[PDB]
């Protein structure tokens, strides 16, 4: 074929024109996001029961929705929270590769039939099902500079004139809104109320009467009466539209022809919907959008486009309405890309340099420089051919292949200079025989390296998807190379490659270039019979091997593992947990201090603090917060003391001066759904009606018994909340009867006062918006305030709760957890410094097996993935090995000679893990594919060597011991050139710190040192193998 292409020159040019022209049409139109999609898809169901405690939520709403997720295809598990803030969320995780669009439809449907059972008030708020994809593209914030506009003021504006504009800018997937638009707020006064003999039920009603909108009819309605001139629409009642109009609402007429308005019995401002979360930004009233990325959009693209839309709203803003960007994935992705496209440019230049310094001439060294950029542009086609995308993970493929992409190219062009100076044949005709020696040694490179990568895109689970990301990229770039080398490069050798006379070498020249082939030729010889020395007594050397086969095997298992290195991503955040019962205000105080420690102790790094009070990340409570700290550019933050594992220390340390409030700052992983490299996820399950208390015991048993094996298990903690006190206002039924007081009247009076109640809607500035009635905050703060609230009895008399009820404190649980529909408790922890995540698991199960009967356990999340799919490599690669042998045998028509290629595996391995160990790193994915391209080069160098030796033996019938010296001899130069290139091309990563360093570091530092020993060591070894392996049968 390269023969057919050595002749046909333009055919091999056309093909090339296409390929780049294809992967160019594809480069310059293909999705860019930071990562792809690793986590199995999962739909979440959410609901508010305004005012409900955790049990109420749980027994009137959660259990019902749960009893109903049936005949929904591909569920893995189903967990759910029921919180004392009236909140309930239920998440269902599906099989990997389930259609998220179907799963969410099915759920959404099965809900739609359970709604007839949920409480009216829940139905009113509405339940709601969405897909989970908590990877925000960016987060705009919106401050007022004047200090005029409240949280609620600002959020309204955003929800009014911005949210939709952004909602629609091409590329966006989802828009959340930090606040709500306004809501009409009737704020009740039990006293005003108790004057005019009124319940809030009364307020509730009048509002419904006098804010409804009413069907009318229409003048000259069809069927008309014969002979008709007019047809028009009658307009009856519609909806109040102002706090004014609202206050005007009539409520009662007392004996004396008197008139009681609504404003007469309450305040009527125009607040927000939910007063639970307080977020401000660098201390000032805030709000704004978390924008996510539509599936298959362009991060960089939509990212700009969204700035674009903001821009053109900024004129029309009110008095001092600044816009701020505490998060934008984009800076990182750009920088991540500008740093990879560079590693690509860099490598090309270094190949130009290592050829011109070994073959010497702007021709031979212009060959791979216009051939690799063909393969790469061509991967971006077969990449886009499987709908992939340019993301951190595919970009680190192909620049992890670059080594295999050159060894492919170099070794053709070099194998031409070799015969075109040893038999001194011409240009065109010299390139045959050159590529009759390498033909199926490249077409075995193909089938062998397939076997080393492909079986990677087979690992089950989440991490499974990462491996695919590489596994395709590599094989896609790789097989496309072994093609370019069969087609364009042979054709490029024999066209820009001026002949060299049998022996031209350059052993005498007017410069350095002379000295090179001079002192290279010395060193060629200096080494070739050094191999020769080895060959007589070889058993001394198999001992160095057997103590390298163990060398890795001693390490490797000593090496710690993980998934993905963190990076200084630009933001980081601080936790804040004030204890049981602490309030919104107490919590805010603490956030302020945290905002201070950053805006002082740290200016120079912190660019802003987004602090959210009410939403902590282990709950929604008055007693929890979170602060989102965005930093100044990587540029202005030089050295380990301006990056993040640093600033974190000075805060996490710094935050033990806060006596009340558990407050730890920390850093987000690369992929947000990763979960600790060594963390397990354990569910304790109530399996026979046991009840909260009994489970809580069980839990503690296990949790106490757990924390007395620090040998193996650290930080075994409960993920949920501790029980707490709650004020129970039990009604005497009998009593209420007697006095003529209707339970429902009682109930909603209290509920309305203390919980609030969405009444109906009204229209504000052409916008439908909620209307809530709820007691002004002064009459609803402490148990003694109950006093103020009068219900009305059968006979018109005003009656207080002491008449017919009693109070009493008790324990609670403000959060109730359930796994697979049974009640549960989430236990987290890790295997103790030294052990494996699997051993911890193993132990935990054994500790659990000893609990009271009716208590069960089950693993989830990370630890569920792992329990199923994380054991495969042994099993898997067994089948790769079997195909590496079978590929090799075929190539070498030998049931045995393959053996001398395969035994080169550990040689790379060792230098690779060596460099990770004496450098403080982890056996992770970036290191792990490294290990594969390193097995990859070292097997395909050993392919060509054990090829040549096998040939001059069947071709010429040369010496078993002499063909080898000849094989080694001629194949020595390529090896060196390629590996000089590689080892220099990896240099720039291996030191890199700053914007995305850990990424860079992990791929480099493992491959570089493994290239050193794979090479500066297989020189001696591969011929040692061939000899020993041949003389076995």
Residue 50 vs 936, nearer CB to ligand P9D? 50
223: number of Cβ within 10 Å: 4
Which of 271, 403 has the CB closer to a second copy?
271
CB 190 within 8 A of CB 788: yes
Among 717, 778, 850, 919, binds a second copy (CB under 8 A): 778
Q: Hey, which residues between 75 and 104 contact a second copy (CB under 8 A)?
A: 75, 77-79, 84, 86, 95, 101-102, 104
Q: Closest separation between CB of residue 163 and ligand P9D, Å? A: 11
Q: Is-contact 1006 959, C-beta < 8 A?
A: no
Task: Return d(Cα 134, Cα 292) in angstroms, integer.
Answer: 8
Measured CA to CA in angstroms, residue 69 lies from 91, 514, 820, 861, 923 at distances of 11, 79, 10, 20, 40
Q: Does residue 164 belong to the site contacting a second copy (CB under 8 A)? A: yes
CB under 6 A: which stretch of 271-279, 504-512, 739-747, 877-885 binds ligand P9D? Answer: 271-279
| Pair of tokens at residue 139 | 């987060």
What residues from 512 to 531 belong to the interface with a second copy (CB under 8 A)?
none
Q: Does the footprint of a second copy cover residue 338 (CB under 8 A)?
A: no
Binders of ligand P9D in range 663-702 (CB under 6 A): 668
Q: How far is the CB of 991 from a second copy (least distance, A)?
A: 42
Written as six digits, the tokens of 788 are 């103020």
User: Is the Cβ–Cβ distance between 376 and 432 less than 8 Å?
Assistant: no
282-311: contacts with ligand P9D (CB under 6 A): 290
Contact string 421-460 vs a second copy (x = CB under 8 A): ----------------------------------------
Dihedral sign of CA atoms 908, 912, 914, 915 in order: positive
**CB of residue 850 vs a second copy: minimum separation in angstroms?**
13
Query: 202 contacts which partner out of a second copy, ligand P9D, none, CB within 5 to 8 A by kind?
Result: none
Strands 790-792 vs 798-800: parallel, antiparallel or unpaired? antiparallel
DSSP reduced 3-state for 770: strand
Using rule CB under 8 A, residue 590 touches a second copy: no
Candidates 549, 731, 828, 976; binder of a second copy (CB under 8 A) is 731
CB of 525 or CB of 728, closer to a second copy: 728
Nearer to a second copy, 321 or 552 (CB): 321
Q: Does the protein bind ligand P9D through residue 49 (CB under 6 A)? A: no
- What's the min distance (Å) between Cβ of 692 and ligand P9D? 25
796 interacts with, out of ligand P9D, a second copy, none, CB within 5 to 8 A per kind: none
Gap between the Cα atoms of 900 and 959, Å rounded: 17
Element (H, E) at 450: helix 439-453
Here the tokens at position 882 are 């079997």
Give the pairing of strands 768-775 and 184-188.
Answer: parallel
| 179 interface partner picked from a second copy, ligand P9D, none, CB below 5 to 8 A per type | ligand P9D
**Cis-peptide, bond into residue 223, ω within 30° of zero:** yes
Q: Is 878 in the site for a second copy (CB under 8 A)?
A: no
Write each residue from 195 to 234 as x if it is in contact with ligand P9D (CB under 6 A), else as -, in one continuous string.
Answer: ----------------------------------------
Contact letters for ligand P9D, residues 548-577 (x by CB under 6 A): -----------------------x------
- Contact residue for ligand P9D among 162, 402, 472, 612 (CB under 6 A): 612
Give the count of beta carbons closer than 10 Å to the beta carbon of residue 505. Answer: 16
The CA distance from 530 to 545, in Å, is 17
What is the distance in angstroms between the CA of the first residue and the CA of the last residue of the chain? 35
Between CA 764 and CA 604 the distance in angstroms is 44
Nearer to a second copy, 828 or 890 (CB): 890
In the 8-state DSSP scheme, what is residue 29?
A: S
- Rounded distance, CA 503 to CA 748, Å? 103
Closest CA to 680 of 629, 634, 637, 717: 717
Q: Per-residue contact track with a second copy, 262 to 301, x per CB under 8 A?
A: ---------x---xx-----------------xxxxxx-x
| Closer residue to a second copy in complex, CB, 181/978 | 181
Whole-angstrom distance, CA of residue 650 vs CA of residue 508: 63
What is the rounded CA–CA span in Å between residue 418 and residue 946?
Answer: 18
Smallest separation, CB 573 to ligand P9D (Å): 7
Under 8 Å between Cβ of 608 and 370: no
Pairing of strands 284-285, 87-94: unpaired
- Rounded Cα distance between 909 and 916, Å, is 11
Determine which residue in the list 80, 379, 437, 622 makes contact with a second copy, applying CB under 8 A: 622
**Among 279, 303, 435, 1002, contact with ligand P9D (rule: CB under 6 A):** 279
Residue by residue, DSSP assigns 875-936 as: HHHHHHHHHHHHHHHHHTT-SSTTHHHHTTHHHHHHHHHHHHHTTT--B-HHHHHHHHHHHH
- Per the structure block, which two tokens stand in for 244? 């004014």
CA proximity to 679, closest of 459, 559, 867, 840:
840
Instruction: List, in sequence order, every residue forming a beta bridge with 574; answer none if it has no partner.
Output: 627, 665
Residue 51 sits in the site that holds ligand P9D (CB under 6 A): no
CB under 5 to 8 A by kind: which of ligand P9D, a second copy, none does 112 bind?
A: a second copy
Q: Which of 187, 246, 358, 628 binds ligand P9D (CB under 6 A)?
A: 628
Answer for which of 40, 326, 718, 861 binds ligand P9D (CB under 6 A) is 326
Among 136, 187, 801, 885, binds ligand P9D (CB under 6 A): 136
726 binds a second copy (CB under 8 A): yes
Q: Which of 588, 670, 621 is nearest to 392 (CA)?
A: 670
Binding mask 157-196 for ligand P9D (x = CB under 6 A): -------------------xxxxx----------------
By beta-carbon proximity to ligand P9D, the closer residue of 489 and 613 is 613
Stretch that binds a second copy, among 136-144, 462-470, 524-532, 899-907 (CB under 8 A): 136-144
Using CB under 6 A as the binding criterion, the count of chain residues that bind ligand P9D stands at: 19
- Shorter beta-carbon distance to ligand P9D: residue 92 or 175: 175
428 vs 650 by CB, closer to a second copy: 428
Which residue number, 277 or 987, has a Cβ lying nearer to ligand P9D? Answer: 277
Q: Which does 176 bind (CB under 5 to 8 A by kind): ligand P9D, a second copy, none?
A: ligand P9D
Cα four-point dihedral sign 875, 877, 878, 879: positive
Q: Which of 139, 843, 1012, 1024 binds ligand P9D (CB under 6 A)?
A: 139
Residue 556 CA to residue 632 CA, distance in Å, equals: 39
Rounded CA-CA distance 296/298 in Å is 7
Minimal distance, residue 774 CB to a second copy, in Å: 8
Token pair 């290279």 in the structure block, residue: 520
Give the residue with the Cβ less far from a second copy, 821 or 996: 821
Q: Does 534 bind ligand P9D (CB under 6 A)?
A: no
Query: Toward a second copy, which CB reaches closer, 310 or 972?
Result: 310
- The tokens 């309405």 sit on which residue? 321
Find all residues with CB under 8 Å of 598, minimum gap 6, and list them: 606, 609, 627, 629, 651
Name which of ligand P9D, a second copy, none residue 78 binds, using a CB cut-off of 5 to 8 Å depending on partner kind: a second copy
Which of a second copy, ligand P9D, none lies near 668, with the C-beta cut-off 5 to 8 A by kind? ligand P9D
Does 403 bind a second copy (CB under 8 A)? Our answer is no
Tell me which H or E stretch contains 839. helix 837-848
Binding site for ligand P9D (CB under 6 A): 136, 139, 176-180, 274, 277, 279, 290, 326-327, 571, 610, 612, 615, 628, 668
């Amino acid at each position: 074929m390269p023969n057919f292409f050595i002749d046909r020159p333009i055919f091999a040019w056309v093909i090339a024109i296409i390929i780049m022209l294809a992967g160019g049409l594809a480069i310059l139109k293909l999705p860019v996001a930071q990562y792809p999609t690793i986590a199995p898809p999962a739909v979440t169901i959410s609901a508010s029961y305004p005012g409900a405690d955790a049990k109420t939520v749980q027994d009137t709403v959660t259990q019902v929705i749960e009893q109903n997720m049936n005949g929904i295809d591909n569920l893995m598990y189903m967990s759910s929270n029921s919180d004392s803030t009236g909140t309930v969320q239920i998440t269902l995780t599906f099989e990997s590769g389930t259609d998220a669009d179907i799963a969410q439809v099915q759920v959404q449907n099965k809900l739609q039939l359970a709604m007839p059972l949920l409480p009216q008030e829940v139905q009113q708020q509405g339940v709601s099902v969405e897909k989970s994809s908590s990877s925000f593209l960016m987060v705009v914030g919106v401050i007022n500079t004047d200090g005029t506009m409240t949280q609620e003021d600002i959020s309204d504006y955003v929800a009014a004139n911005m949210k939709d504009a952004i909602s629609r800018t091409s590329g966006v997937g989802d828009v959340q809104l930090f606040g709500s638009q306004y809501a009409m707020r009737i704020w009740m006064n039990p006293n005003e109320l108790n004057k005019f003999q009124l319940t809030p039920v009364d307020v509730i009603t009048a509002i419904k009467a006098q804010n409804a909108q009413v069907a009318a009819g229409q003048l000259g309605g069809t069927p008309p009466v014969k002979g008709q001139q007019l047809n028009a629409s009658i307009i009856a009642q519609t909806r109040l539209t102002s706090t004014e109009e609202f206050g005007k609402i009539l409520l009662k007429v007392n004996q004396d022809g008197s008139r009681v308005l609504l404003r007469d019995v309450a305040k009527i401002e125009l607040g927000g919907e939910n007063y639970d979360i307080i977020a401000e930004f660098n201390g000032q009233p805030a709000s704004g959008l978390g924008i996510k990325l539509a599936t298959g959009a362009n991060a960089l693209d939509t990212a700009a486009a969204i700035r674009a839309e903001l821009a053109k709203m900024e004129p029309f803003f009110p008095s001092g309405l600044k816009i701020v960007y505490p998060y934008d994935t984009t800076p990182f992705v750009k920088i991540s890309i500008h740093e990879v496209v560079k590693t690509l440019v860099e490598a090309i230049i270094l190949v130009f340099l290592v050829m011109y310094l070994f073959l010497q001439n702007f021709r031979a060294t212009l060959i791979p420089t216009i051939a690799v950029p063909v393969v790469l542009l061509g991967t971006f086609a077969v990449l886009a051919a499987f709908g992939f995308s340019i993301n951190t993970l595919t970009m680190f493929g192909m620049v992890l292949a670059i080594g295999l992409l050159v060894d492919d190219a170099i070794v053709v062009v070099e194998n031409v200079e070799r015969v075109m100076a040893e038999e001194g044949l011409p240009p065109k005709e010299a390139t045959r025989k050159s590529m009759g020696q390498i033909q199926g040694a490249l077409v075995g490179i193909a089938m062998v390296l397939s076997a080393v990568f492909v079986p990677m895109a087979f690992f089950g689970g989440s991490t499974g998807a990462i491996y695919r990301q590489f596994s395709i990229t590599i094989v896609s770039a790789m097989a496309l190379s072994v093609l370019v080398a069969l087609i364009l490069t042979p054709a490029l050798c024999a066209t820009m490659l001026k002949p060299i006379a049998k022996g031209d070498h350059g052993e005498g020249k007017k410069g350095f270039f002379g000295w090179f082939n001079r002192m290279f030729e010395k060193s060629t010889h200096h080494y070739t019979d050094s191999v020769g020395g080895i060959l007589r007594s070889t058993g001394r050397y198999l001992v160095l091997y057997l103590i390298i086969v163990v060398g890795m095997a001693y390490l490797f298992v000593r090496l710690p593992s993980s998934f993905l290195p963190d990076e200084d991503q630009g933001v980081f955040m601080t936790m804040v947990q004030l204890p049981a019962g602490a309030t919104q205000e107490r919590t805010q105080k603490v956030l302020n201090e945290v905002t201070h420690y950053y805006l002082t102790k740290e200016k120079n790094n912190v660019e802003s603090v987004f602090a959210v009070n009410g939403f902590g990340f282990a709950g929604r409570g008055q007693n929890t917060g979170i602060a989102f700290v965005s930093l100044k550019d990587w540029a202005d933050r030089p050295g380990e003391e301006n990056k993040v594992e640093a600033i974190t220390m000075r805060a996490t340390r710094a935050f033990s001066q806060i006596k009340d409030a558990m407050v730890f700052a920390f850093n987000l992983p690369a992929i947000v759904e990763l979960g600790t490299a060594t963390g397990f996820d354990f569910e304790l399950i109530d399996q026979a009606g046991l009840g909260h208390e009994k489970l809580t015991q069980a839990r503690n048993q296990l949790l106490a018994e757990a924390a007395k094996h620090p040998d193996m298990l650290t930080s075994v903690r409960p993920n949920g909340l501790e029980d707490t006190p709650q004020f129970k206002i039990d009604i005497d039924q009998e009593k209420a009867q007697a006095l003529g007081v209707s339970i429902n009247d009682i109930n909603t009076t209290l509920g309305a006062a203390w919980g609030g109640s969405y009444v109906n809607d009204f229209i504000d500035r052409g916008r439908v918006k909620k209307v809530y009635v709820m007691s002004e905050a002064k009459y609803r703060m402490l148990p003694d305030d109950i006093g103020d609230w009068y219900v009305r009895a059968a006979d018109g008399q005003m009656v207080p709760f002491s008449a017919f009820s009693s109070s009493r404190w008790e324990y609670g649980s403000p959060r109730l957890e359930r796994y697979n529909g049974l009640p549960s408790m989430e236990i987290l922890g890790q295997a103790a410094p030294g052990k494996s995540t699997g051993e911890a698991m193993e132990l935990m199960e054994q500790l659990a097996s000893k609990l009271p009967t009716g208590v069960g356990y089950d693993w989830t999340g990370m630890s569920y993935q792992e329990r199923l799919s994380g054991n495969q490599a042994p099993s898997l690669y067994a089948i790769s090995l079997i195909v590496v042998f079978l590929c090799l045998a075929a190539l070498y028509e030998s049931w045995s000679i393959p053996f001398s290629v395969m035994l080169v595996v550990p040689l790379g391995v060792i230098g690779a893990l060596l460099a990770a160990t004496f450098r403080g790193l982890t056996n992770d994915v970036y290191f792990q594919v490294g290990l594969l391209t390193t097995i990859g080069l070292s097997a395909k160098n050993a392919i060509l060597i054990v090829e040549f030796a096998k040939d001059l033996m069947d071709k010429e019938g040369k010496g078993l011991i002499e063909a080898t010296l000849d094989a080694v001899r001629m194949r020595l130069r390529p090896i060196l050139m390629t590996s000089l290139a590689f080892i220099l091309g990896v240099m720039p990563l291996v030191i890199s710190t700053g914007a995305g360093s850990g990424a860079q570091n992990a791929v480099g530092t493992g491959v570089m040192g493994g290239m050193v020993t794979a090479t500066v060591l297989a020189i001696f070894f591969v011929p040692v193998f061939f000899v020993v392996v041949r003389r076995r049968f």
